[PDB]
């Protein structure tokens, strides 16, 4: 999943009075100040794109309400129950939270209500054999060995499309079964031909 | 610290380095890292797929001998957690084990921790993939007995097709 991940927080140390309200400041300033160390709980190998420059933006409002967004490609674990495959469905999670700070230090909230706090672009679908039916947004708690933590979770609901695996296995298998059943209409004395049907159909089904 | 049997590994770096630094008033330091590592596990496959493998992570100090650094497992046998939650698709973790010892090198002795898992393979996939075609082809091969001797073409086609199917099962197994 490719995301613009936006965070915002108050920082009383970074209030100012100046000619302009919000400083659309360079992304270099992100390293000079404290920022949340948000990490993805189920992420495997995520990429923070930095072509041509680190794809982050930081803005400081006059009151001190910092906004800070970054461009990421996160690949995360989506455990699957393949009992009903290819006619199954999945709810892939996307869960993130502070790595170092517990509940008593940093707490995560949604910018708007959870339904509209996560938005998917209309053309943003690189899914070949899946249909993204929708998303459900929630928050929860995790009690790690270091302490308590707040984990913000989204669940993307996906339904597998059946046409590919139909053409892959079901149609060839059905045609093979009909081909085997064709043997009944031959004469009983055509032993080599009927044996050829039987063995060839067995081999095809084995493959 | 380093991992002796590590092939390739990295510390997660999104949104930042998944690292934790906590200082307590008594001078205690807690240092956490989210690490993904691919570690070598030498697998004995003579009993494959009805096998039982033993894979170990090998934590060791590189530059400091036992005179400088002493490893230990914090919390004893309760140190390693979350193993019970893992459901591998092929394997199942029969048990896990923690060991602490000292390993001797030319430079000197060093502390050593070992975290081992005893994985046991599941046979359902192999039963569906390799075995069951083999038995069913074996029953297929015996149909030639019930055909008359004079009908040579039928029995020959049956035998040759059974041999071909055994060979293609074997090669589609050994390819992977």
């Amino acid at each position: 999943i490719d995301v613009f991940f936006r965070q915002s927080w108050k920082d009383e140390r970074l209030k100012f009075k100046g000619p302009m309200t919000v400083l659309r400041l360079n992304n270099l300033m992100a390293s000079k100040i404290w920022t949340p160390d948000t990490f993805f709980h189920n992420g495997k190998k995520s990429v923070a794109h930095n072509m041509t420059m680190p794809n982050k933006l930081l803005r400081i409002t006059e009151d001190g309400t910092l906004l800070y967004t970054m461009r990421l490609t996160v690949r995360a674990e989506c455990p699957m129950h393949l009992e009903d495959f290819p006619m199954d469905a999945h709810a892939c999670p996307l869960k993130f939270g502070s790595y170092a700070y517990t509940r008593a230090e940093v707490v995560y909230e949604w910018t708007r209500e959870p339904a509209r706090s996560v938005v998917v672009a209309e053309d943003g679908s690189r899914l070949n054999q899946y249909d993204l039916l929708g998303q459900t947004v929630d928050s929860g708690i995790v009690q790690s060995s270091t302490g308590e933590y707040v984990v913000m979770t989204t669940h993307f609901h996906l339904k597998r499309k059946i046409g590919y695996f139909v053409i892959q296995t079901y149609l060839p298998c059905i045609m093979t079964v009909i081909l085997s059943q064709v043997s009944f209409w031959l004469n009983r004395e055509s032993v080599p031909a009927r044996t050829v049907f039987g063995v060839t159909t067995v081999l095809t089904m084995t493959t | 610290t380093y991992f002796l049997n590590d092939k390739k590994s990295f510390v997660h770096g999104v949104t930042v380095k998944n690292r934790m630094i906590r200082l307590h008033p008594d001078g205690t330091v807690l240092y956490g890292l989210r690490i993904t590592t691919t570690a070598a596990c030498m697998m004995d496959l003579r009993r494959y797929p009805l096998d039982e493998q033993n894979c170990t992570l090998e934590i060791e100090s590189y530059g400091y001998t036992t005179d400088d650094i002493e490893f230990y497992w914090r919390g004893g046998d309760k140190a390693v957690t979350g193993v019970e939650r893992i459901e591998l698709p092929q394997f199942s973790i029969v048990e896990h084990r923690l060991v602490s010892r000292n390993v001797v090198f030319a430079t000197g002795a060093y502390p050593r921790l070992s975290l081992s898992f005893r994985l046991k393979r599941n046979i359902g996939y192999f039963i569906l993939q390799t075995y069951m075609p083999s038995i069913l082809i074996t029953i297929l091969s015996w149909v030639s007995f019930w055909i008359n001797y004079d009908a040579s073409a039928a029995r020959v086609a049956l035998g040759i097709t059974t041999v071909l199917t055994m060979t293609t099962i074997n090669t589609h197994l050994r390819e992977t």
Partner: nanobody
């Protein structure tokens, strides 16, 4: 008063499934109480947030709910469910496995 209710599974390992609790009062629909995920992640309903605590023992394949600070209108039959959350994690329709239900009553 305080209470603890356990829910043990059998015939199927639910280590990879989401295990949740629901409440049914007389004359009301099913209400979601709490849920625990494979990653030891806890979700709680607003009506019972901060009071009830959900835990999962993966070794013996069970989910436990610890109820504290009971108040009289919490009397109801409590159901234990396990399943993968599709369109859900808060809706009863997303779960396929359910318990027979245990009655709970509070006397004033």
């Amino acid at each position: 008063g305080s209470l603890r209710v356990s829910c043990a599974a059998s015939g199927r390992t639910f280590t990879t499934y989401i295990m949740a609790w629901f409440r049914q009062a007389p004359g009301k629909e099913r209400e979601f109480l709490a849920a625990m995920d494979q990653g030891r992640i806890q979700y709680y309903g607003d009506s019972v947030r901060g009071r009830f605590t959900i835990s999962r023992d993966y070794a013996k394949n069970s989910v436990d709910l610890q109820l504290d600070g009971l108040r009289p209108e919490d009397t109801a039959v409590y159901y234990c469910a396990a399943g993968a959350g599709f369109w859900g994690l808060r809706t009863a329709s997303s779960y396929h496995y359910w318990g027979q239900g245990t009655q709970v009553t509070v006397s004033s």
